[PDB]
Amino acid sequence: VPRGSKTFIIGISGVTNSGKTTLAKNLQKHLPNCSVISQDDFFKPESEIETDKNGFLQYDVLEALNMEKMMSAISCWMESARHSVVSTEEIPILIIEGFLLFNYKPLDTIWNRSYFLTIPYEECKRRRSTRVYQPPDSPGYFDGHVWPMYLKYRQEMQDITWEVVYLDGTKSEEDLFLQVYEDLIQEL
Ligand SMILES: NC(=O)c1ccc[n+]([C@@H]2O[C@H](COP(=O)(O)O)[C@@H](O)[C@H]2O)c1
Ligand SMILES: [Cl-]
């Protein structure tokens, strides 16, 4: 059986501002031959984003994202992964991280492991206000768009077809890194 075509793909989703991107990065520096793709790199330009009845920019839905572009990026990684180990098993690793991964049906069978970072409403709001997006959050954007769209995502995930490990995002960076690392090494 020829080597080189196997991969191990990890999804890290979760609410906005829950430490997803930092978790991906901490895992990557402790894992061999590991890449990270970030869903936020595939948002459409603000000019292509729709606006709802109350004037809120619609960013927190899959329509805001070029998911075909993101698939193409995943495909590029897979082709590179095939040549990452010289012939003479060492299985290349991809971490895909973003707030809206587990409702996207074309990727439903891609995940070898799945983690979902959670933080409650008040702490999520507080964290979100310390961060600057481009475009910036409008007044009342968290309540008017971000949180309702998050709750919509969680209901969409009620009929998911694979196991998800839910994580407490109020834990420290190191705590979260160790928990996931401890689980991950057993799956690899
Ligand atoms: N990256 C962008 O171009 C952009 C623009 C406006 C809002 N956002 C926000 O990014 C959030 C998702 O990213 P995080 O999970 O890193 O918070 C969404 O909740 C969305 O409101 C991103
Ligand atoms: Cl798309």
Side-chain angles (χ1 to χ4, degrees), residues 1-24 26-49 51-52 54-68 70-188:
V1 181
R3 289 172 173 192
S5 77
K6 292 197 185 291
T7 58
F8 190 101
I9 310 201
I10 302 150
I12 299 176
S13 197
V15 70
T16 183
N17 283 267
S18 61
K20 298 182 303 297
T21 295
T22 287
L23 179 59
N26 292 335
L27 288 164
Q28 185 185 33
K29 51 190 173 151
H30 299 87
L31 287 173
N33 196 20
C34 181
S35 291
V36 182
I37 289 163
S38 285
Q39 185 176 23
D40 281 19
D41 291 341
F42 304 89
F43 269 116
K44 290 164 188 181
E46 191 194 348
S47 64
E48 301 172 22
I49 299 289
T51 299
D52 77 9
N54 296 118
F56 294 117
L57 287 161
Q58 298 307 94
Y59 268 103
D60 291 53
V61 287
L62 283 163
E63 293 59 47
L65 290 140
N66 201 338
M67 291 303 280
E68 296 187 37
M70 197 186 93
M71 280 192 304
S72 173
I74 296 169
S75 292
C76 280
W77 174 81
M78 277 174 185
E79 172 62 16
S80 162
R82 280 158 66 67
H83 312 293
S84 68
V85 182
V86 72
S87 189
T88 51
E89 190 176 5
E90 293 162 316
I91 296 163
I93 302 168
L94 176 63
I95 298 167
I96 309 172
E97 72 87 11
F99 85 123
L100 269 190
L101 292 179
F102 301 153
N103 56 341
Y104 189 64
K105 297 293 170 286
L107 292 177
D108 68 357
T109 50
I110 202 177
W111 315 110
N112 299 117
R113 259 307 210 177
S114 299
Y115 303 95
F116 194 90
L117 282 154
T118 71
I119 49 164
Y121 168 84
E122 293 288 349
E123 173 59 9
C124 186
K125 194 180 192 167
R126 188 199 66 72
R127 285 179 185 206
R128 177 87 183 210
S129 294
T130 72
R131 185 162 157 187
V132 176
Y133 293 84
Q134 169 51 51
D137 284 1
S138 65
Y141 194 62
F142 193 80
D143 291 318
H145 187 68
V146 178
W147 196 255
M149 289 310 92
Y150 173 60
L151 293 178
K152 176 170 158 273
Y153 181 39
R154 299 297 305 274
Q155 59 182 11
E156 285 160 359
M157 276 172 67
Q158 274 166 4
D159 59 17
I160 207 158
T161 65
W162 71 97
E163 290 183 13
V164 180
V165 184
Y166 297 91
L167 305 165
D168 185 355
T170 69
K171 293 176 182 173
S172 70
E173 252 186 66
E174 179 66 10
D175 192 341
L176 287 163
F177 161 73
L178 289 175
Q179 187 192 343
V180 183
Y181 191 80
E182 286 157 24
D183 180 76
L184 205 40
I185 58 186
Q186 310 193 57
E187 302 289 315
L188 294 167

